[PDB]
């Protein structure tokens, strides 16, 4: 048949063939000999020309305007600016196209079918930490927007030959702090004391609680980072309750509204921004089941597990499970009741379905990382568990990068 | 060269040097990733030789005698044979060594830790779809063992050049009819309506019910299939009841105790044996969440959940969740009541990392599929979530081969 990657449905028996992979044009981290797909991380003027090409090439195709004039003369006029600057820099169409194709393109990201709404901030006449600041604080009043979510994307200068990069040092907007104990615990979210340690350095006073949101440390061009608090009222947090277990409301737990990654680098025809923080909604799993119920994150399992008097002795009693089915309802009836926007993993699956539906007639394929667009918990009890799916590296992109210390 | 590999709950890492001796290529390439495809898109006397060779060498060294004489001679006479006749014949010894390493090497298989126990039936010397019968009734006595079941697999004859295969046709050794009804719906398991027909058109008369045990369809070379019904007696079922929703029961529901794989082939030094059933236990999520929660199988969720009195009106009432982690219990409750043999994913996760350290210290690493390792159900609530993985084919090794019809 068709000389592409075939794709079957297992739950519905149709197949589609993905001829979108073709556009590829950066190697992943298989070969023959064998599958890499299940691990978490993978100028010159010369490349940087190509990739440029490549890049005004799908804008003018995306505008219908492919060989015509104006096509060529944007091609011209990019050649023209790399060959005597060694850069270049995108129009404020090219980089709202860009910024969506990113997001588009993510193989990781379940959320997709939301691609075409984005709100693109450009901050790219940043000059300082304090007005990355004042720049990111309106980005969480516009996406918080009291509740009703707002998917957005900030994006700060790019990378310059010679000149340090704009970086936001958090891994998100907002995160709790982790508290490295006396007997080797920790008070707070684990997965953040590095950073917490750091802010520390930076001057922050700590706090001494399990949800205490940090500051962030924002680093312009070629100077310390600089620390910023977050004014409380901008940042919306959900105190959990269960709908049915009263004493669920007893255990104080809570959870920020805005999931704001801020560390990734999103790359858009060889051009780099270090710093462009980008923010949806939550799937109720990333909290219910990671955040909450991960070994190495706050470890909740065993402590509702005894509070619902389960048998937490032995493994056939599956007392992980049922605790992880409550908790997880806990924070859907939580977000809903406080009217914050959240979607469930049912929900989030089947509308990711559409996605691949709209994308197969748009593109011809839609690259995804089953490991990561399977949710956490009641796997094949989501359509796309049964949906084989081809993943490749396509850009625009956000790529994982460095961190600054 | 050598991948690094991560376990992200506890931080640990180890480098995977087996894959070096992979010998066979998989699906995936640097341009993009098929890892999440269920299947894959006489002979040179050459290649035969040095396949044979290798196993050979396997063989010896397993036993600790590499270079000996033994070793030397065997290495001549295979030669021999295959310089001869274009073929070559195991020894029993080295078919016991080389089904154990088949098992050993299945990168989809999570109950690996007990691959050093597997009975051995040497069925090759069988001529009639009559004598494979016996044997095939001979293997599930022994392996149901009266619900204390023992790993087994029964080997017939090789394939061998311009004849016709031994063949089982049916999946497993025991599963349940599916029966197409007027209205396009099916009684019983959707999943097995083609063998169904199949045995219906060589004579056997259906029953019509939900859980009909079908019966073999065995075929010598170049013969067409014969029909066997199994004895009643041999087939060990257990009836499915929860521990505290008395109405359970009520549904009537029943699994198999012993799972059997029967349609792949099983590769040892160049040789390929076509029919090959192997079985071991069952992993309790293989029948609660996928044979009876699947959308295409005997799709019970929303029964169950009505019985239940669940809210089915949303999904963010999460009454899939619920009703799945009961139905699993039940299964977990109902084999153990039944003293059948059972693990639940949480034991059997357990119990694979544990092998993936074993290996690591025996051979430098383990071929794993982490899409077919992680549990349909509660993935994130097992160690195994949390562990990369790499996948490639070592030999010997259990393949998938073209239904005989
Ligand atoms: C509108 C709602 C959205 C939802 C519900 C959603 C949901 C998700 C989920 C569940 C993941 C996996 C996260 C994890 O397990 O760590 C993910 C990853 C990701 N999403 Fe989305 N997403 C949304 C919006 C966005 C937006 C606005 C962008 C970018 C403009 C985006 C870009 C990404 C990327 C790049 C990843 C991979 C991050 C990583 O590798 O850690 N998503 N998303
Ligand atoms: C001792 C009990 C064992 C347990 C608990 C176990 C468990 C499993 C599970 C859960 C799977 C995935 C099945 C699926 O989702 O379809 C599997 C696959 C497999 N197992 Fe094991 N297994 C056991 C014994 C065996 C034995 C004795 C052999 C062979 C000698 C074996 C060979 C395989 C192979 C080749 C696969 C892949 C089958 C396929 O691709 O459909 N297993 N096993
Ligand atoms: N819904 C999300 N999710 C992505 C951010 C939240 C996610 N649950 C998280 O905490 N991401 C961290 C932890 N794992 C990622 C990694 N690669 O290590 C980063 N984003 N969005 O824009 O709407
Ligand atoms: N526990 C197992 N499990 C494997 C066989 C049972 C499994 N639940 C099953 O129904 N397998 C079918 C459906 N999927 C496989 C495939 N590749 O299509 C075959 N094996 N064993 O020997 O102990
Ligand atoms: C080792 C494995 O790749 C790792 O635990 C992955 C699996 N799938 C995931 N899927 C999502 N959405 N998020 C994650 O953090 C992970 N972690
Ligand atoms: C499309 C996807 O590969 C498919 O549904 C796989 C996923 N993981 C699985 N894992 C196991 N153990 N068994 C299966 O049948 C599957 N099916
Ligand atoms: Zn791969």
């Not at 924070?331 to 691949?356: C, G, P, Y």
Request: aromatic content about 10%; proline content about 7%.
């Amino acid at each position: 048949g068709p000389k592409f990657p075939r794709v079957k449905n297992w739950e519905l028996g149709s197949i589609t063939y993905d001829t979108l992979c073709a556009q590829s044009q950066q190697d992943g981290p298989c070969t023959p000999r064998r599958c890499l797909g299940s691990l978490v991380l993978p100028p010159p003027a010369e490349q940087l020309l190509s990739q440029a090409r490549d890049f005004i090439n799908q804008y003018y195709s995306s505008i219908k305007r492919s060989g015509s004039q104006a096509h060529e003369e944007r091609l011209q006029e990019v050649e023209a600016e790399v060959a005597s600057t060694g850069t270049y820099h995108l129009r404020e169409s090219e980089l709202v196209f860009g910024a969506k194709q990113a997001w588009r393109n993510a193989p990781r990201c379940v959320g997709r079918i939301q691609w075409g709404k984005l709100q693109v901030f450009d901050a790219r006449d940043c000059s300082s930490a304090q007005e990355m600041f004042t720049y990111i604080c309106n980005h969480i009043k516009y996406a918080t927007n009291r509740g009703n979510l707002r998917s957005a994307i900030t994006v700060f200068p790019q990378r310059a030959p010679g000149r340090g990069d704009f970086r936001i040092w958090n891994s998100q907007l907002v995160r709790y702090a982790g508290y490295r104990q006396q007997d080797g615990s920790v008070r707070g979210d684990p997965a953040n004391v590095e950073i917490t340690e750091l802010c520390i350095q930076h001057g922050w006073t700590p706090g001494n609680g399990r949800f205490d949101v940090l500051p962030l440390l924002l680093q312009a061009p070629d100077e310390a980072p600089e620390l910023f608090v977050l004014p409380p009222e901008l940042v919306l947090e959900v105190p959990l309750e269960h709908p049915t277990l009263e004493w669920f409301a007893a255990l104080g737990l809570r959870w920020y509204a805005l999931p704001a990654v801020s560390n990734m680098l999103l790359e858009i025809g060889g051009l780099e921004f270090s710093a462009a923080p980008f923010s949806g909604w939550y799937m109720s799993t990333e909290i219910g089941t990671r955040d909450l119920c991960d070994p190495h994150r706050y470890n909740i399992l065993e402590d509702v597990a005894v509070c619902m008097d389960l048998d937490t002795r032995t493994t056939s009693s599956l007392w992980k499970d049922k605790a992880a089915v409550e908790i997880n309802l806990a924070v859907l009836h939580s977000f809903q009741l406080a009217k914050v926007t959240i979607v469930d993993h049912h929900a989030a699956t089947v509308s990711f379905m559409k996605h691949l539906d709209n994308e197969q007639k748009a593109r011809g394929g839609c690259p995804a990382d089953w490991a990561w667009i399977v949710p956490p918990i009641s796997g094949s009890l989501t359509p796309v568990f049964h949906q084989e799916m081809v993943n490749y590296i396509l850009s625009p992109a956000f790529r994982y990068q460095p961190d600054p210390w």
